[model samples]
Structures are given as structure tokens and as C-alpha cells.
Target: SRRRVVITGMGMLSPLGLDVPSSWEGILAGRSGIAPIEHMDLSAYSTRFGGSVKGFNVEEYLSAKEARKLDLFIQYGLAASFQAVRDSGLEVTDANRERIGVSMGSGIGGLTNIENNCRSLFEQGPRRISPFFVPGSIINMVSGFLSIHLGLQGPNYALTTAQTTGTHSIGMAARNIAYGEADVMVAGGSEMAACGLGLGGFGAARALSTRNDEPTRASRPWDRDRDGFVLSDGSGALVLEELEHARARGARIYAELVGFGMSGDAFHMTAPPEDGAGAARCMKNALRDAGLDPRQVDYINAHGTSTPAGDIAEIAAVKSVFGEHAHALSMSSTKSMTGHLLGAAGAVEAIFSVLALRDQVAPPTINLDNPDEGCDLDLVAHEAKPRKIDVALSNSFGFGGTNGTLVFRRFA
Candidate 1:
């Protein structure tokens, strides 16, 4: 029999808050974390506003000297994983150190650093490049740095699949523990994609909201005037342990990560087909892996990024998978409040899913003023709802047609 995996801890740095509790509080209260972009000039950009991490101090998580060597993504990832490790209470003794591992990633790792280095090369010279540029900005460096910091020696790596990165990281970590390759894994994704290059590139692709007049209300999923996703900065991590390992250590159980599934759209690079067949397959795979009926799912933390195309596609996927029962369950997009965290979105949404199960409430999808014709599911619009959320699922669909779904069942 395959070993069971359960979530013992979760930590996150969101645009909404610095930690899990505050972020979830903002989510449940339907507060918008998006605002005018700071720390840079967006005078000429089509989208001048986004969900930037506010009032964060790297010194809180790392020494001044150490913080300078790492990029924002790495710092955020490290802070989140550190919080997760402390929360899990998993001591890394010499004997147990070999059995703990890390899996983390960022969709667009160190964009700010890349932009700065590129400018340095152009304005000054190649010799002016910072020596720490490469190690600090690379995608896998988050995993590399995390393992070094935590002294975890088992299966350490990262998987980058755009927005699916976090879900895949968490899923792969659970597989490691379940397959006996490791007893525990710190897994998740981080992103700081609010820099000039990030905004310029996505803006060039016309993928961001141009509703500059109202930043907070810009990310209105399924609303009639909805535009596109708002790029954001954040990180999220979870501690996954084998059931017996957690029980032996008396770790606080959050929820059982019973199912994980992935799929490729095969149709488009940046958008899903109107039918959402690929997304439907992903959700079906997760349900099949969990051995649960669609009707048994109490809530879904949707991959509803407020982009017109994405919002409609996720609804189609839900209807295709759950049929009439789609209306019976609560489905909401915390993205309406947190905006899109890119690579960190899936992991953070999974944390929200677990907390939903823990607290028996479905967080709200704010700014859903006018639901599209097909977006008629019980979206928990405008406000949080108290409900029996025993099983919660989170979805993430990324560019390049990648998709991932995670299923969490309350561990009773």
C-alpha cells in the first residue's frame, strides 16, 4: 500500500499579509490587497498597479549581509519555509536530517535582479555585473538555498511550470514521502515578478489589467467589466510528512493531502480551450487519485485569476467535472483579493484550502459584481460563508498550457 501524506504545517508571504493568519483574515474579510505599484516608476506602463508585497523587511528573515546576496524570491521562499519548518516542529537531528528534503520553485525567478543586471551591463559594462547575480536569480536556487539553510539532505529539487510550479512542487514532495524516499518535505513556490521587465513583458503580451483608475477593484473575476490578471509578489510553503512520521513526532495535523493531478492543454500557450477539457481532466485525475466522488467535494479554491478567458474556462471545467453538483459546492477565488501570485498562487491557494477545511468556512471571491452567464456556480461571491468544508481542492492553470490540481481532505 502507498503511504499516506498529511500536511503538518503551512507558511506564506502574501500581498495580503506577511504570514498565514493575516492573509487568511484578509481573504475571509474580502479585503483587496492590490494597490498602486511602489518602489518603481510605472509612468509609461499600461498597468501601473499590482499586488506588491508591502512593508517587507528582508532583515527579519535573514542577516543584512546574507540578505544582500539573495534575490527577493529566494528571501521570500526562505522565510516561508523557515516558518513552515518551525510550525511542523520537525527537528533535524543528525539521524533525521537525511530523511528531510525540500522542493520549491518560482515561475519568474528574480526578474528584478535580471532587470538590474541587464541595465548594469548596458549602462556600465559586463565587468560591473554582480557576482551573486547568477546564484541569486536562478529558479532552482530557492531549493538549493533552502536545503543549505535547513540541512535537509534528501531528494532536493524544484519543478517550474509557471503557475503550476507550486502545486507540482507540493505534489512531488508528497510523492517523495509517500514512496519512502523521504520522511518529510518542505515544498512550495515563491515569486517576485513585479519588476520592470515583468510588467513590461506581460504588458507587451497584453495580459494585465489596464484598469489603472481603480487598482483594488481591477481584479474582478467573472465581472462584466473584468479585464486581466494583476501580477503579484508572494511565496508559500507547506510541510508534508508521512502519516506515521507525523504521528510519531506528535505534529499538529492540518489536513491530509490525498490527491494531486496535472495535465497539459495541448491547445494553446496562454489560454485554455473554451471547453476546458484539459482542466476537467486534471480535476478528474485528482478525484480519481483520491477515490472520491465529485459530489463529496465541499469547496474549491478556484484558479480564477480574473482574466476574462481564465474565469470562463475554469467555470466550464467545473461544470464539466461536477455537473449539477457544481452549484451545490462553494467555489471562490482568493485571487480576487490577493491578485495573482504567479508561481506562488497554487501553494498559497492550497494553504487557504486547508485552512478552509480547518475552520469550516469558504473564503470569498470579492469583486464578482456581475457574474457571466456560465459563471453561475455557488462562487461564494462578495463575502465569506460558514459551511462544512471537509474536502477542499485548489486549481492552478498556467501559461504554456500546464495545469495542476490538489485535493485536501480534513484529517479527523
Candidate 2:
């Protein structure tokens, strides 16, 4: 068998909390983090609610001068990266510096930054644009800044697969370790798309929820009355280490990453087929990679983004993949609480899955008052559920019919 990869540390900034414990506690308590858009003007938006990072002081992760140059996505990614690196307790010395890498991603990178520069170019002329715009706003700057900041000299890159960016990045990081390319990798996703163009573009596509009246109950995945998904902002990261290297340092392992699977839906541009054939294949590929059987999965952090078609499509996918065990396993969506973090959604949800494996408690899909047709799985609704979860799956499906899945097994 190839080398094994284990999660030694974790960090996240979500709609619910600034770190893992805070987010996990809020999730287990069944509290929703989504509410009215606080920092942006939403008078023209049909969807007035989103998940914005609150009380984030970039000074905590970067100096003021350094902070002003990068965008929020890069800042969020760097914050989570440092948080995870500290948590992992892996000292990066000259001997080991080149053996470490960073792989972070953002789906809609620096929309607000782009918007500001666009206004500057049009109103005040091109000369008024800041020199830091391109480097600060690009998607790969998260990994770039983190690698440069921390002296990590291996495999520094970012993946942008829409909502699946985080999952793919983590999976790729693990592959690097497994294939002897690196011994340690920091992997995850970040996003900050609550700005003008961010909201306006998605709003124009009618991809956001119009839950202007009750934002708290807006992202109700699988709910019969659900209209659409909530757009949100956040970041999540994990420190993955080769098993033996982690053991050498007596690292506290969270879980073992055993499987990663990906697929593309050739069917529609914005919609998944009701039968979820692509999703089913994706899950199957993950199980095959993990050497796991359908009955072995205990929980699934679903990509249940509360949209009318997406929610049911995921349900059908699960039922098709899990079959008789479909009704037995618990599947839930943290999106109901954190809203959809877009590209960051997969990484954040992957962290939630690791926590579910650690604590053996599946978080709730809040506001799931009623199950829509075909939503027959044991959707952990409204409250958290305690179960003997040994294996978990995290799913992320992005735009253009792309899908990714990660399988995690409980560390003994």
C-alpha cells in the first residue's frame, strides 16, 4: 500500500465561529450563523442574507502593512494556515522546511478587490489603481503568501474547482504525501464573496436564497419550502502529515484520509439530473479508493445547499450509492447553519466531517422543518445526533457539474 496520510491539526473561520471548537460547539448546539448581510449594502439584492466573517482582525495573522496588500480570501487562508500550523506542533527547521507544502484555494477570489479596482480604473483613470491589485486578488495568492510567510518550499499551489476547490486541494495534498512528493502539507479553501459584484453576479443568476424575511432560517436544506442556497464567506484548513512522520512527533491525529473521488456531470450547466448519476459515480469511486464498502460509512456531510433541485439531487445520489444502508446512515448539511461558503464550503464541511469523526456526533441541518419528496435519508434535522461514527464522507459539487468526495476514517 502507498504511504498513509493523517490529519494532525485543523483550523477554520466560518459563519458560526472563528475556530474549530467554536464552530463545532455552535453547530452541535443547532445554532445558525447566517443572517442579514451586515457589512455590505443589499438594498438591490433579492437575497439580503449571507454568512460574513465577524470580528476578524487581520493583525492577528499578519502585520497591518502586510494585511492591506492582500485581499480577504488570502487573509482568511493565511489565518487558517497559521492556526493549523500552530495546532499541528510541527516545527519547521532547515532539515524539514523543504518537505512541507501548502495547498489552499478560493472559488471567487477577491471579488471586492476587483470591484474596487474596476471603479478606480473607470472613475479616476488607470493610474489610480493600486499596484498590489493583481497579486493581491488572484486565487493562488493564499498558498503563495502562506508559503512565503512560513518558509514552506514544497508543492505550493492552489486549486479552484468552484465549490469543490477545498476538497480537491486536500485530496491533492494527501496524494503528494502518499506519492512521496512531500511529508507534510497544509490544505484547505477560503472565500470572501459578500461584496457588490460577488452578490450581484450570483444574484443575477438567481442562485441565492430570497429569504429576506427570516435570514436565520434561510438555508433550509431538504426543507419542503426551501427556495435557494445562501451565499456565505469563510475558510477552513487542515495539516496533513505522513503517518510515520506524525507518529515520530507524537502528533494528535484527527482522522485518516483514505479516499478521494471526482467526476463531472455532462448533463446540464447549472442543474444536476434528478437521478444523481454523476454523484453516484463519484461516491462509488471514493469507496473504491478507500477500500470501503457501502455499509461501512457511518455519516456523510452532504452538499445539501438548500436549493430546490440540488438538495433532492444529493439525496437521490446518497440513496443510489448507499442503497439499503441509505436509511441507516446519518447525513446532514452544515450549510443550513453556516450557509454555503462556496469554494470554502468543501474545506469547512470537510473539517466538520473530521470533527464528526472525532466526537462521534453529527451536526444538524437546521431549519429542516419538513422533508421534500425523495429526501428520505436520515437527515439529522434541527438538532445534533450522537452516533458511533467510524467512517465519514464529505461531498462537494461545484458549478459546471463538477463533483468531489473525500472519505475519512476515525483514527484509533
Candidate 3:
């Protein structure tokens, strides 16, 4: 028999809210996490707004010495990981450290640190660069620092598959437990690319929303008035345990990680396949892996980043995969509320998906006052809806034409 992995605990630090309970409350209340962008000076930029985690006092979570060596993104990852560990109530002494692991991912990693160090290197020579430069700026450090902080010795690694990075990390973590490598694993992703270079690069690519005046409605996925995705920063993590491990410890199980699928578009570096064929295959593969039918899906946490081609292509994929059951699923983009968190989107959205299943409520896709004609399906728009969501699917397609999907069934 195949091993079963279930989510026993989760944590997050995002524009939505600092912790799970608060974030879930914010979602249920339909509160938009987007606001006037404050992390960087947006005075000279086209879009001066985005989703940012506000009023986070990192000093409370880390020592001044330790915090100084870490970048903001890694710091957020550490904080969120701490929250998840506490929530899981897992005792991690020297006894079981060898059986625990961490697989956290960060797409861009410490961009703020990279930019700062590079400028120092160029202007003041290599002597001015801190010894912590490489460790601070690398994407894998999100997991490295997290593993060291938590003493998880089983398997510590990171994935960097652009936007699909988080889902892939979670899936691999679950697979590790199922494959008998570990009994417990911590998994997720962290991202914060709102720095000047980060924003300027995407702006040059014309992939970001230009809705400068209206921060609240900037992200309009599957809507005719959509512009582009709004860049944001945050981190989310989940604790996955072998079923017997969770049951023996009496941990609270949020849901079971039932299915996972991945595909490559092989078309363009930045854009998805025109017909969404890659995404369709990913969805079908995940359903097959879960031994489920398309109609069994109660809700989908869409990869709706509000981009023109991405949203439409994802819809096409949905139509192809579900066929007659396309309309039976309620799809919503929480990015409409939290903006796009890039590589961290899948992990953050995965947490939101599990929250939806637990509460039996589906978050609505805001900014859909004008729906796109080509997109067809229920988006649970404008307001949160109470529904019995026994199973939920989350989708994420990333740069380099990568796609990822996961199927989660509620734990009884």
C-alpha cells in the first residue's frame, strides 16, 4: 500500500495576515491585502501599489545578530517556519531530528540583498562586500536557514522552478514521507521581489499591472479589464507527516496530500502553450494520481495571476481537462486579494486552499465586476461562499513554461 501524507499544521506571513487564523479571518471577511506599496519607493514607478505584509516586527522573531546576516525573504521564511512548528506541536529533540526534514523554496531568493551587495561590490570594490553575500542572496538559503534553525536533519533541500517552485517543493516533501525517507517534513516557499530591480525588470517585460491609481482593483483575473499581475512578497509553510505519525501524536490534520502533477510547455520561456495543453495534462495527471474524477473537485485555487494570456490559457486548460464537469468546480484567485507572490504563490495559495477546505468556505475572486467573455465558469466572485468542499485543487504555472497542480482531500 502507498503511504499517506497529511497536512498537520501550516503557517504564513503575507499581505493577507501574519498567522493562519488571522489570515483565514481576513479571507473570510473579503479583506484585500493590497495597499499603497510601502516596501520600496513607488513614486517614480507606473504602479505604486501591491500586496505587502505590513507591520511585521522581525526583531521579535530573531536576534539582531542573526537577523542582520539574513535577508528579508529568509527572515520571513524563518518566522513562518517557527509558526508552523509551533502549530504542529511536534516534539523535535535529538531523538527524532534524523527523521525530520525541510524542503522550502524561494524563486528569486534574496533580491534585495543581491542588489545591495552588487552595488557595494561595484562602487566600493570587493573588499566592501560582506562575507555573508553569497549565503544571503542565494535562493536555496531559504531552506538552508530554515533547516538549521529548526534542526531538521532528514532531507533539507530547495526547489527553484520559478512560480511552480512551491507546489513542487510540497509535492516532493510529501513524496519523501510516502517513500519512507522521513516521517515528517516541513515544506513551502518564500518570496519577496518588490525591490527596485525586481519591479523594473518585470515592468520592462510588461508583465506587471499598470493600474497605478486603483490599488484595490489592480489584479483582475479572468476579467476583461485585467491589466497584469501585481508583484508582492510573502512566505508560507506546511508541516506534512506520515498518517501514522500524525495519528500517534494526535496532531490536527488539515487535509491529505492526495495528488500532484507537473508538465512543461516547451513553447516559450515566459508564456504558456497557446492552447493550454501543458496545463491540461498537469490537471489530468494529478486527477489520475489521486484516483479521482474531474467532477470530484469541489474548488480550485487557480493560478489566476490576472495576466492576459495566462488567465485565458488556464481557463482553456480547465475546459479541456474537466470537459462537462468544468462548470461544477468553483475557481477563485486569491491573488486578486494578495497580489502575485511569484514563486511563493503555490505554497501560499496551497495554505489558503486547505483553509477553504477546513472552513467549508471558498474565497471569492475580487475585481471581477467585468468578466471576460472568453472565460466560462463560476469564480465565486465578489463574496465568499459557504460550501462543502471535500476536495480542492490548486494550480500554478511558472516562468520557463512549467506547470504544477496538487489535489488535497479533507481529513476526517
Candidate 4:
């Protein structure tokens, strides 16, 4: 028989707040985390705001000596991991340590380091580059540091699939446990690409919002005046354990991870197919994996990025898969509150989905003043609603046409 997977713990650091409880409370209150850029100069950029991680003190989570050696993304990952491991209460023994693994990633890792080092090479000299540049800036270094810190030895993996990175990491980690590769895994994603190059690149692509005067209102998903996604920085982590193993250890179970599905659009590098065929197939595959009918799902955490094309495409995709059940289902975009965390968006939203199951409440899609014609789903607009959500699905789509969906069920 295949093994079962369940989430024992979760951790988050986002613009709404520094930890999971605060962030969830902010979401429930319909509060937006986005604001005017404070960390860098915005005079040269088209987009002047983002959902920056606030009130994070490195000394609280890491030693001064240790914090200096890692990049912001890695530090965020470590902080999230610290909270998750503590929350799971999973002690690492010599025997079980080898079976524990880490699968974490960042979509655009170490962009700040790369930009700074390049400036040093051009403005000062190659010798001015810091010795920690390589280790700090690499994409896989988050997993490497996590494994070393947590003593996870089974599998150390990292992915870089734009916005889908976090969802993919969690999904793959669950598969590893179900396939008997490991009994416990720490999986999620982090992102801190709100720096100059990060903003410049996305801004140049016209992929970021330019509503600088109203930062909080900039991320208006499904709204007719939606400009684009607001770039944000944060991290989210989850601790997964096999069901039998968790029960034996008296671990608190949050929810069971039932299904994971992935697909590639193969149609566009930066846009989805107009008909959303690939995304529809992805959701269908996840439902099939979970042995679920369309009507079974109670809620969906949409990949609604506030983009003109992406938002409409996702609505069509949801309708395609859910058919008649689409009207009964509640789907909302948390991005309206947290802005877009890029690679970390999926994991953070996944955490929200799990919380919805735990609390039996569906979070709202704030600032839905003017929903587009095709975007007529429940959306839980403007305020939260009490609902018995037994099963929830979170969707994540990325550039390069990569897509992933996760089905989380209330543990009976």
C-alpha cells in the first residue's frame, strides 16, 4: 500500500506579518501588505511599490556571525524552517535524521547579491567581490543550508520554476514520502527579489503594477482596472510526515496532502494558452489523482496574479474543470492581500488553504470592487465567510508555462 502524507507544521514570513498567525489574521481582516518601496530608490522604476517583508530582525532568528554569510533569501528560508521544525516538534535522532529531507527553492535566488557583486566588479574591482558571493547567491543553496541546519539527509532538492517553485517543492516532497524515500520532509520556498535588478527586470517586462500612489490597492485581482502583479518578498515552509509515523509520535496533524498535478503550457513563455487548456488539464489531473469528483472540493486558492491575461485564463480554466460545480465552489485570490511573492507565492497560499481547512473559513479576495465579466466565482469578496471546507485546492502557474496544483483534504 502507498504511504500517506500529512502536514504537521507550517511557517510563514510575508508582508502582512512576520509569522503565520499574524499573516493569517491580516488575511482574515482583509488587510493588504503592499506599500511604497522603502528599501530602495523607486525614482528610476515604473513600479514604485511592493509587498516587502517588514519588521524582520536577523538577530532574533540567526546569530550575527551566521546571518552575514547568507543571502536574504537563504536567511528567510532558515527563519521559516526554524519555526516549522519547532512547530512540528520533530526531534531528530541519529536513526531518523538520515530519513529526513529538505526540498526548498527560490525562483530568483540571490539576485541582490549578484547585482551588488557585479557593481563591485565594474565600479571598484573584481577583488572587491565578497568571498561569500558564490555560496550566498546560488539557487540550490537554500536547500543546502536547510539540510545542513536541520540535519536532513535523505533528499536535498531545489527548483527554480518562477511562481510555481514553492508548490512544486511541496508536491515533490510528498511524492518522495509516498514512494517510501523518506518518512519526514521539510518543504517550501522563499523569495527576496524586491531589489533593484529584481524590480527593474520585472518592471521592464511590464509584469509589475505601476499604481504607485495607492500601493495597497495596486494588487487588485479580478478587478477590471487590475494593472499587474506586485512583486513581493517572503518565505513559507511546511513539515510533512507519513501518517503512521506521525500518529506513532503523537504529532498534531493539520491536513492530508491528497493529490499533486503538474503541466507545461508549451504554448507560450510568458502567457497561458488563450483557452487555458493546459491549466484545465492540470486541475483535472490533480482531481483524478485524489480520486475526487468535481463537486467534492469546497474551496480553491486561485493563481490570480491581477494580470490581464492570466486572471481571465485562470477563470476559464476553473470553469472548464469544475463545469456545473464551478458555481457552488468558492475560489479567492490571496495575492490581493499579500501581493505576489513569486516563487514563495504557492507555498504561502498553500499554507492559507490548509488554514482554511483548519478554521472552516474561506479567506476573501479584497478590492474586488469591479469584477470582470468572466470572473464571477464566489471569491469570498471583501470579507471572509464561514464555510465547511473539507477539501481545498491551491493553483500555481509560472512563467515558462509551468503549472502545478495541490489538493489538501481535512484529515478525518
Candidate 5:
């Protein structure tokens, strides 16, 4: 028989706020974190805004020299994981250290670092590049550094599945525990891609909102006037423990990780199938895995990135999966407030879903003033809604048409 797994602690460093509590508060208040780019010069870019982290200090989690040696993406992931480890209070004694693991990832790892170092190789001599360049810029280094720093010794892994990176990591971590490969796992995702290349590349593809004059209103998922997603940067982490192990430690349980599902839209590279067939099947797979009926779900933290086609396709997916129950359940996209965190979106949104179950209030999809056609479900628009939440679902879809879904339920 498989062991049960539950989230014992969560950490967040988001565009909306610095920690889980503050971020959740910002989500409820419908605050937007998207603004004019302040981290770099945006004079040459078409999109001048993003959901950038504010007032964050790397020295809070690492020493000056240590902070300087790693990429900002690694720093963000380590900082968030530190918070989660502290919050969980899971002391990694020698007895249990070997049974703990780390699984964290970044979709576009170290873009800023790569951009800066490559410039040095061209402008300056190749020897001028820093020794830490390769280690700091790889996708797996988030998990690598986290494991070594925290003394976690088992099953270190990472993913690079675009937006699905975080959700997939969390799901696989749960599997590791459930299948007895580990007793505990710290898992999540981080991203720091707000540099010139990050902005210019997405902008070149016309995948970013051009609401430079009204940055706060740009990431309006499911709204009629939304142009495209606003790129954002941040990280989120969760401590997952075997249910028995967590109970023995008297750890506070946030929610049970009951199901995980994934799929691919084989039809397209950057878009979902027009009917949302792949997304619907993904949700169905999760429901089947959880042994859950569609009627049992109370909320969904949607992967609504404010793009025209993506928004409509996800709505169609929900309608297809839930059928009549789609109208009864509340669904909202917190991305409207935090912008799109890309790789970190799934983990951050999953944390929001767990918080919703704890507080019995669904976070709002801000700026849904003009909902587009087929988005007629109870969207919890503009304001948070308080309800009795027994189960919640979080969805994330990535470039290359990848999809992931996680199901969390009130622990019995």
C-alpha cells in the first residue's frame, strides 16, 4: 500500500508579497504587483512592465560572498526553501536526514546570469567570465544547492517543463514519499527571468501585455481587454511529509496532496488544442487519481495568464471536465494580481489553493470587469469569496503544450 503525503509547511517570495501570509493577504485584497521595470533599463523593449520582486535582499538568506556567487534564481529558490524548512520545523537529525529529499526547479534558469556572462565572453576575454557561471546558470542547480545546503540526502531532482515545472516537482515529490523512496521532500519552483533578454524574447513573440501606461491592469485573465500575460519573477516552496512521519513530529498539516495529473497538447507548440481536449483529459486524470467526483471540488486556481486564446481554452477545459458542476464551483486566477510567474506560478498558486482550504475563502481574479464570452462561471471576480472549501485544484500549463494539475483536500 502507498503511504499518504501532506503539505506540512509552505514558503513564498512573490511579486505580490515577500512571504506566504503577506502574499495571501495581497491576493485577498486584489493587489497588483505588475509595474514599470525598475531592475533594468527597458528603453529598447516593447513591454516595459513586469511583476518584479520588491524589497528583496539576498543577504537575508545568504552571506555577501555566497549571494554573489549564485544566480538570482538560485538565491530566490534557496530563500523560499529556507522559509519553508523553518516553518515546517523538521529538524534534519542524522537519524532522518537520509530519508529526506529536495525537488525544486526553474523553467528558464539563470537567464540574467547567462545574458551577463555571455556579454563578458564577447566584450571581455573568455577568461573574464566568473568561475561560478556554469553552476549558477543550470536548471538543476536549484535542487543541487538546496540539497547540499540543507543536508537533504535522498532523491534530489528538478524539472524544466516551462510553467508546469513547479507543479510537476511537487507532484513527483509526493510520489517519492508515497512510494516509500523518502519520508519527506522539500519541493517547489523559482524564476528570475525579468532581465532584458527575458522581456525582449517574450515581447518579440507578442506574448506579453503592452499596457505600459496601465501596468496594474494588464494581467486581467479572462477579461475582454487583456492583451497578453505579464511576465513575473518569484519562488514558492512546500515541505511535504509522509502523513505518519508528520503526525509523529506533531507537524501542522496544511492539506493532503491527493492527486496529480499531467498531459501534452500534441497538436501545438505554444497553444492548447482549440477545444481544450488535452487540458480536460488532464483534469479528468487527476480526479480519477484522487477518486474524486467533479461535484466534490470547491475551487480551482486557474492557469489563466490573461492571453486571449489561453484564457478561453482553459475555460473550455473546465466546462468540459466539470460539466454542470462548473457553475457551482468557484474558479479564479490569482495571476491577475501577481502577474504570471511562469515556472513558479504552479507552486505559488498551489500554496494559494491550500490557504484557501484553510481559510475557506477563494482568492479573487482581479480586474474581471469585462469577462469574455464562455467565461461565465462563478469567477469570484474582483473580490475574494468565503465558502466552505473541502477540496481545491490548481492547474498549470506550459509552453510546448505541457499541462499539470494537483488536487488538495482538507485532511480528515
Candidate 6:
């Protein structure tokens, strides 16, 4: 039989908090990190509201020169990974170097850097753009730089499946351990899309809310007043270790990495499939992969991005998959508080799911005062819910109609 894998350590750098515990506490407090953009001159962008990571001093994590070489997305990824490794308490000496792998991802890559370089190349000249532009803008740097920084020598991989990046990262990393390719893996997703190009593109596509006046209430997932997702910036990471390896070191496991599912709609690049059938299939497959029934799941961290279509579609999908148990499950889109972190959304929500198993508190879906009538599931709204959550599922659906689901069972 293959080895079992579990998540031993977690790290999060979001608009809510700089790390896991702080972020979870904020979530439980029903705090909303969505706010007006202050980090940069967002006056030029029409949609200026988003969940921006506050008090982030990259110099504290890396040298000034090194920090300048990477964009904010990569900075967030590196910081989160370092925190996870430290929290794992895994001693990665020369002997065990080959057994450690890195699986990380970024959906849009160095978007900030790409925007700058493109402007310079167009307004000035090609020669004006720095040569580091290519390496800095690549999506795989989440793994490359993290592996280099942590001295991890095992298989380093990255995937850019839009918002599904996080789910794919952890799912594939668990595969490595199950297949004996590695004993431990650092896996997650990160993104920083709070800038002009990132905001402008989503705005042009009508995918971002233009309610710049009320940032906190802008990301109202499943709410009747919901408009569009509030694009945010940050990273979320988890340390996955072999079951035996974690037990040997006496590591405190938050939850087991039980199962994962991936599906494609092939219907649209920016829209989900009709009837939410594709998403339902993915969630059903995830439950089956985890060797559990739908009724056994206590909660669901939804990818309800606050958009009209996304939220309704996700609710429909859940009902179709979970049936009568769907109403019994306390589902909430924590994105209502964190804002949509795009590629990093799944990883962070996955962290929240594991935390639910550990703390027995389901974070609320803030700003859900007037929710849609069609979404009849028990959406833990406005306030946190206290319950015994032994098993939970986190869902992520990306722009390309790519859907991913992860099921985590509380460690016995």
C-alpha cells in the first residue's frame, strides 16, 4: 500500500493576517480585510477596492537587492514557504535533502513585473527593460526560488491552472509522497494582482466589482447584492509529510491530505459550465477519492467568488453532488473576508478547512446579509459557527473553467 500523507504545518500571508494563527483568529472574529488600495497609486484604476496585504516589509524576509529581483507575488510565496518549513520543525540536513520536494504555483506569475516591463518596452524601448524580466515574470519561480532558498533538492514542480493552482499543487505533492517520490513537500499557491494591469484586465472583462467606496462590502459572496470578486494579494502554503515521517518526529498534524479531484469544463475560458455539472462531478470524485460519503463531510469552503454566476453555479453544483446532505453541510466562502486571491485562493481556503478540523470553528461568509434565494445551503454567514468538524472539503474554480476539490479528514 502507498504511504499516507498529512499536513503538519501551514503558512498564510493574506490581507487578513501575515500568518496562519493570526489569519484564522481574524476569520473567526468575522473581520474583513477588504479595504481601499493604499500600497500603490490606484487612482488610475476604476476598481480600486481589494484585500491588500498590510504591513508587509519584504526586506524583513529577504535582502533589499534580492527582494527587488522578484515581484510581490514571489515575495509572498517565499515568505509563506519559509514560515511553513520553520513551523514544520523538519531538520533538512544533507542526508535528507534528496527527500524534500517543493510543489508551488502562481496563476498569473510576476504580474506586477510584467506590467512594468511591458510599459517600459512600449513607452521607452526594448533595451530599457531589464533582462531579469523573463525569469521574474515566470510562474514557476514559486518553486524555483523557494527550493533554492530552503535547500530542497527533491522534485520541484509548478502549475498555472488559474485559481486551481493551489489545489493542483497540494494534490500533486501528495501524489509524490504516495508514490514514494519524496518524503516531504512544500506545496501551495500565491499571487499579487492588486496593480494596474491585473485590476484593469479583470475590470475590462467585468470580473471585478467597481464599488471603490465600500471595499469591505464589495466582496459579498452568495449575497443578493454581490457584484464581482474583490481581487486580492497573498500566498498560502502547507507542509506535507509522510505519515510515518511525521509520527517519527512527533509532529502535530492539523489534518490528513485525504483526496483531490480535478475537472475541466471546456466550455469557456472565463465562465463556468452550464448547470454546474462539471463542478458537481469534481466534488463527487473528491469524496470518492477520500473514501468517504457526502454526508460524512461537515463543512465546505466554497469558491463562491461573489459573482452572480459563480456563486449560484457553485451552490447548484453542491446540491447536485451532496443531495440531502448538502443542506446539512455548513458551507461558507471565506473569500467574503479575504477577497479573492485568484491563484492563491484555494491554498488559503484549504488552510481554513484544516483549521476548521483543529479548532471546530467555521469562519463566516461576511457581507452575506441578503443572500441569493437559490443558494439554499447553510452558508455560515456574518458570524463564525461553532461545531464539531471532523471532515471538510474546499473547492476552487478558476477562470479557465478548471475546477479542483480537496477533502481533508481530521487526524485521529
lDDT of each: 0.91, 0.91, 0.87, 0.91, 0.92, 0.88
How well does candidate 4 score on lDDT at residue 392? 98
TM-score against truth, every candidate:
0.99, 0.99, 0.98, 0.99, 0.99, 0.97
> Model 2 reaches what TM-score against the true structure?
0.99
Error of 1 at 266 (Å): 0.4
Regions more than 4 Å wrong, model 6: none
Prediction 5 global C-alpha lDDT: 0.92
**Native-to-model Cα distance after best TM-score fit, residue 136 in candidate 5, in Å:** 1.1
- Candidate 1 — which residues are off by over 4 angstroms? none
Off by over 4 Å in 5: none
Error of 3 at 355 (Å): 0.8
Q: Which one wins by TM-score: 4 or 6?
A: 4
lDDT of 1 by residue, 1-412 (tens): 6899999989899989999999999998999999999768899999999888788888887899988888899999988898888888888989998899999888889888898899999999999999999998888887798788778888888888998889889988988998899999999999998888888999999999999999999988888788899888999999999999999988999999999998999989898888888999999999998999999999999999888788899999999999979989999999999989999999899999999999999999898989987887899989999999878999999998899999999997
Which is the better candidate, 3 or 4, if ranked by TM-score? Answer: 4
Model 5 Cα lDDT, one tens digit per residue, 340-396 = 888899989999999999999999999999999888999999999999899999999
Q: Give the poorly placed runs of model 3, Cα more than 4 Å off.
A: none
Candidate 4 residues 15-40, lDDT tens each? Answer: 99988999999999999999888857
lDDT of 3 by residue, 100-184 (tens): 9998888888889988898998999999998888887777786787677778788988898988888998988988998899999
At residue 277, candidate 5 shows an lDDT of 87
